[PDB]
Amino acid sequence: HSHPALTPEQKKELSDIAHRIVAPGKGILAADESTGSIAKRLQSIGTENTEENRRFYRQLLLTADDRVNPCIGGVILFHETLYQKADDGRPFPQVIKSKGGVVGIKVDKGVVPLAGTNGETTTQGLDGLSERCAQYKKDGADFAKWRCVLKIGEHTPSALAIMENANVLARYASICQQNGIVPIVEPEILPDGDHDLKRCQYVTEKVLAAVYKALSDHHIYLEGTLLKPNMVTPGHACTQKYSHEEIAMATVTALRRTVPPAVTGVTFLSGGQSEEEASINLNAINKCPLLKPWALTFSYGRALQASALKAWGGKKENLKAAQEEYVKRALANSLACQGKYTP
Amino acid sequence: HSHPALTPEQKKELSDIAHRIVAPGKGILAADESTGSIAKRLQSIGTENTEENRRFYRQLLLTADDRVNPCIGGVILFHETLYQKADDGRPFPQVIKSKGGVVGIKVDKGVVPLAGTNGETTTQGLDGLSERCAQYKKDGADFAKWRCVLKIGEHTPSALAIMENANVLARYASICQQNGIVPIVEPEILPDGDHDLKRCQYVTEKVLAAVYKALSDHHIYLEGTLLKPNMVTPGHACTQKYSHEEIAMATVTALRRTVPPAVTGVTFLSGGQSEEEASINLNAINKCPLLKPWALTFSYGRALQASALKAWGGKKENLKAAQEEYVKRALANSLACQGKYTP
Amino acid sequence: HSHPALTPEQKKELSDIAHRIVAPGKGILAADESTGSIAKRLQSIGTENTEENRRFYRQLLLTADDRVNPCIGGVILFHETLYQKADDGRPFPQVIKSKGGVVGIKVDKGVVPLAGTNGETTTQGLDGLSERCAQYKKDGADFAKWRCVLKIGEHTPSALAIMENANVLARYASICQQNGIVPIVEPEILPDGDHDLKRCQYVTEKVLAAVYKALSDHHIYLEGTLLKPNMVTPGHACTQKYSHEEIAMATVTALRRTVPPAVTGVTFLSGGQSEEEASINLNAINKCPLLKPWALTFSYGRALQASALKAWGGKKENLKAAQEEYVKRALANSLACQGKYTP
Amino acid sequence: HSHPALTPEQKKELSDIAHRIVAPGKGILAADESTGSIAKRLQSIGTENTEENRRFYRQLLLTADDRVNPCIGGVILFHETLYQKADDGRPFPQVIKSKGGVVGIKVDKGVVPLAGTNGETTTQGLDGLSERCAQYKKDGADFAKWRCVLKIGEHTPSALAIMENANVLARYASICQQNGIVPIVEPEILPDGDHDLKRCQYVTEKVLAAVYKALSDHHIYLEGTLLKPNMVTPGHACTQKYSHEEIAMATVTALRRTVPPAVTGVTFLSGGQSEEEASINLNAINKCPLLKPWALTFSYGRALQASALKAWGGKKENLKAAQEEYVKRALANSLACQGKYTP
C-alpha cells in the first residue's frame, strides 16, 4: 500500500540538494579517503601519515582558488575531515559551503567477504546509520556516499553478490533519505581482469538493473538520489584496444538501458584511470549522440588530486603549486562533464 | 555470461521497426479486437457479427483518406483481419503498408485466473508462439501486442500477479524479438474501483519497475520494444476530481521513475476514456515540462473508432461519413502525441 | 492476503490421490513417451512406428500379471494412449484403475529455447491447460506430469533458466490443482557433462530451493503434489568413480536441504541409468540412514521397460516374454523403493 | 559455482553444536534481555535496575539445581552477562557449560523502522559482526540469537519487510557460521491484532518460505542452524476461540510446508503466552500426529522465568524459592518438548 516514506517537503529538500550537487559544469571532489587509504597516498610522496598532514592536504584541496567554485558541486569527506578546521579558523564544511559546494560524508564502513562466493564482498555500515546521518546533517553534510564493490570473473558477479549489494545500497539510501541526506549509490564494478568492453557492459547493465529494482522495492525517491557507477571500460589486462568513443558508447548504452530518467545525475568514478584518461572519457560520454536524460559528471578522487599530491610533495612551500595542479584538473573535468573539454 | 540473444543485424531490424512505429506525430490504431470482443461493438449499432461485417468495418478503418498516413505509425490486427482482403483485392497488411504504416498482430490468447488471488489473472499464449510469430513475420506483421491485466484493490495487485504478468511479458517479448517482431508490452492497470490518483501512480510505478526488471532478466532488447501502459488516472468510482495537468504529471512521473530511456516509445491505451478525454490527456502528457526521453503517443482502440462505429451504423451508405469520424480522431491524436492538440 | 485457492474438499481429494500414487512399495510407470519419442525405441527393435504397434506395446505394459499391482501406484500416459483400447475392449485408463493404479497424463508441450542463454530451455504447455486438465479429469486422469530441463555447464543453469522453469512448474501445478489433478513437478537436471557429484548436488539444491519458493509464491498445496527430481549423480563424462552409497547420500542430502516435509513423495527419474543401476541407486537411497519424511520411490520409463522392449522385438509371439521382463523390473523397483532390493 | 563457504570440519563443528543444543528433552533458556528490556521486569517486582541486581538474577537462573541439566540445552545471554561472574568465582559461561548447556549470545542490535511501510521494521547488527562473533567464540559462546520482527496487519507483513528481514537473517547466519557459531534464526511474527489462526498460518508459511529461500541464496548450512519461530496462534484481540490441538495442528502444518528437514531443530518462542499456556501448546505440538523431522522444543524467556522473578521479589532471602519456580518450569517444558507433559 502507498505509505509515504517522505513528505513533499522532504522530497523537495532532497531534490534540491541533488540538483545542486550535479548542476551543469559541476562535479564531485571525492576526498573521503580514510586514514588507512590515504596512508599509501602520503607514502608515495614521502609524507608521514599524521593528523596534521591529512588536515593540511585536505585544506589544500578545499582552499583552492575561486576558479574551482563553478566546477565543484559537492565534496565528499571522511569522518575526520568533517570536524577539522582550516588555518583561518573555519571548519571545513563551512569552507566548502562558502565555495558554493555541497558537503557529503562517507558513511559506509568498508567491505566484508561474502561466504560461499569466489572472493565477492558486500559492504557494512547500516548499524546506527540513522543517528549518524542525523548528526552529519546537523554538522553540515547534505549528501552521503556508499560504495559497493563487484568484480568481473569467470563466475562473478554472482546472483548473491549483486542482490546483496543492491539491497544494502537500497537500505542505505532509505536511511539517508529519511535523514534528509541525498544518498549517492556507488555500485563500482572493478576493472581488474582481462574482460573486454562487451562483458563489462553486460555486467554493468545487470548490476544497474538489480540496483534500481532494489531502490524501487525500498521506496527510494529517485529524484533525491545520485548514481556513481563505473565507466564501461575493458579490464586492465584486456588485450583488445578500444577507442574513447567506443567506451563512451558502451557506458551511455548501459546507462540508458537501466537508469530511470528520474535519477537526477550520474557522477562517474575513475577506477584507476589516469587524470587525462578520465577527463577524455567523461568528455566523450557527454559528446555521445544518444539521449541522456540525467546529468553526466564526475565524482573523482585520484583523477582530480594525483597531480596535486605529486606537486605538494608533503612540504609547506609547494602548497600553491599543488593547488594549481588541482585547479587545472577541476576546470578540465568541468569541461568534460559539459562535453566541451579539449586536451 | 554474455550470450547474445540477438545479432547486431537483428537488433538493427527491431530498432528500425520500433522507431518507425512511434515516429513523431504518429501512433497506433488498435483494431485487434477478436470476434467475441467486437460482438458488443457491432450489437451497440444493431449489426450482425458476421465475417463480412467485421471485414467491412476493418476495411473502413484501413481504407481511410491519406490524411491518416502521417498519423498512424502502426495498426494492430486480430488474426482474422491479417488474412482478409479489401474490396480492391489488396490484403489488409498490404493496404496498411501502402499507407505507410507498420503491421502488428495480437498474439496473446486471453486472460486466465490466478489461483489463490482475489480475482487476479495472468495471460496465456506462449505455446507455439515462436512458429506463430514466424508465420506472422512472413505474412507482413512486424510488431506484436500482448496485454496483461492488473487491477487495483484492497490486496491487489499482489506480488504473485505482478511477478507472473511481468515474467509472461518478458517471455513473450523474448520470443517476438527472436522472430524479428517488435513486442509491445501492455501491462494495463484497470481503472475500475474508487482509488485516487496517488494509489494509481504508486501501483503503476511498482508494476513498471517489476516489468522492466523482468525484461532485463530475460535479455530483452529494450530499443526494439514498445511500452503500452495505462495512463495514471483515478478509479472510475473515485470521488476526487483531478485536472488534466495533474493526470499528465502523475503519468509522466510514474514513467520517469521506472521506464529506461532505451525504450523507444510509450503508446498509451485509453482504458475507457472518451475520445476527447484520451486526446486531451495525451496532449497534456506531451505538454508536461518534465524530461521525456521516449516518444509519448497513442495506441487507441475505442478512442479512435467510437465515432466511426457510431456514424457507420452497420450500413453501406454511411462508410464515408464513418471514415471521417475516424480521420478527425487520428489527426486529433496526431496532434496530442506532439503536444499540439487544441479542442 | 489469505485467498484460498482450494477448498478443504479439493485439498482432501488432491492429498488422497497423491498418497495413493506413492503408497509404500509402489512407484510410477512412465509410459508417456510421445509418437516422436517412441520412434527411436521402436526402431531400436526393428518395429514400424504405427498406431497399432504403439497401442500393442502400451497394452503389453498395462496388461501384465497381477504381480505388478502392488508395485505400480501410477501410470503416466501420452495423450494418444489415454483414448486407446485394449484387445478385451477396455480403455487403457480403466485397465490401469482395475489394476489398482492411478492414471496420469503428460500435459507439457515440449521444451523451447531461452534466448540469451547457453542452450538453455524452458517448457511450454500452459495455454488451455485448464480445459485440457478438466477433460483429462473427466477421462480418468488423476495426476499430470510436467518436465523442466536444466543442464549443468560452465555458466548453466543460469538464474534465468532456473527462475523461468520454477515459475512454469508453479503455474502448471496451480492449474492442475485447480482442476483436481495432482501435479508431478519434474525439474530434471541432465547428467550430460563431466561434472562431479558435488557440483550436481549443489545445482540440485539450488534448483529445488527455487522450485519450492516458486510453489510457495503460487499458493501450491504441497500435500497434493509430487516431486520427480533427478538423482544426484556425476556427469556421464566424469572421470571420478562414485559408490552407490555416495550417490544415495548426495541425493538424500540435496532433498533434505530443499524439499519441505509436506511434499507427499519423491518419485525419481532415471535419466539414462540402466535398469539395474536405477534399482540399486533407489535401494541405496531408501537405505540411507538420514531422516526421509517423504516417500522415496520410482517414476521410471526406460528403466522399467528396456528389457520388455528388447524381449518383445516388435512381434506378437514374444508378448508374454516381454511382459515378464517388465514384471521383474517392477518387483525389483518395488523392493528398491522400500530399501529391500538385493540383486 | 560451488565455492564452499564451510569446510567439512567447520560443518561438523556447527552440526555438533546444533544437535547438542536441541537434544531430546532439552530446550533453550532465553536470558538475553538487555538492560533496557529487563528494566520493566525488575520494576514489576520493585527492584532497582542495577548491575548487581541483574547479575544476581542471572546467577539465580544459571545456578539452579542439577534437575535443570537434562532440560536446558542452551542459554542465550546478553553481552553484559557473558562477562559476569557468579558468587563462587566462576564466569557465567563456565557455569552454563558445567551444567552441560551450550552458551549463546544475542548479537542483533535492535530493530529499526523501514521507510515506506506501515510501521514495519528490520533489525541491525551486521557491522563488525564477524569480529564480535570471533570474540564470543573465544569467550565460550557457541551459538547466537537474532530476532526479526514482523507484524500482521491490513497491509503487513509487506513484501519489502519479509524480504529485508529474510536477507538480514541470512547475512547474520552466514557470518555466524563463518565464525563457528550456530545461528538461531528468529523470524518472530507478533501476535498483536485480531487476526485469526488461518491468517497467522498463512503469514507464517510465507515468512518461513522467504526465510529459507534467503538462507539457500546465502549458502547457509542448514544442519548447523536452528529455527526460532512464533507459534501459529490467533491474535490477542481475536474473538474466535481455538483449542490447543488446533494451534498445534496449524503450527506443525506451517512448519511442514516450509522448513526443510535438514534444519536441526525448532525452538519456539512464547510471544506473550503464559508459562502454562506455552508448555501446553508445546506439548500439543509434540503430540501432533503429523511427521516432524526436526526437533520441536522451547526457547523460552518470560515463560521460563516469570514465576522465578515473581517469587524472587528482588530480595536475597527468596533466591532458593525463586529457583524452584524456575526449575518446575524447565522440567515442565522438558516434558512438553517430548510430548510427555501433563498439568
Author numbering:
A (entry chain A), B (entry chain D), C (entry chain B), D (entry chain C): 2 to 344
Task: Give the original sentences from the paper that presented this experimental model.
The Apollo (Direct Electron LP, San Diego, CA USA) is a new high-performance direct detector that addresses these challenges by using a novel event-based MAPS detector custom designed for ultra-fast electron counting. We characterized the physical performance of the camera by measuring the noise power spectrum (NPS), modulation transfer function (MTF), and detective quantum efficiency (DQE). These results were extended by testing the performance of the camera for single particle cryo-EM by collecting data on two common test samples, the 481 kDa apoferritin and 149 kDa aldolase. Finally high-resolution apoferritin and aldolase datasets were collected and reconstructed to 1.66 Å and 2.24 Å respectively. Our results demonstrate that the Apollo camera performs well across a broad range of dose rates and is capable of capturing high quality data that produce high-resolution reconstructions for large and small single particle samples.
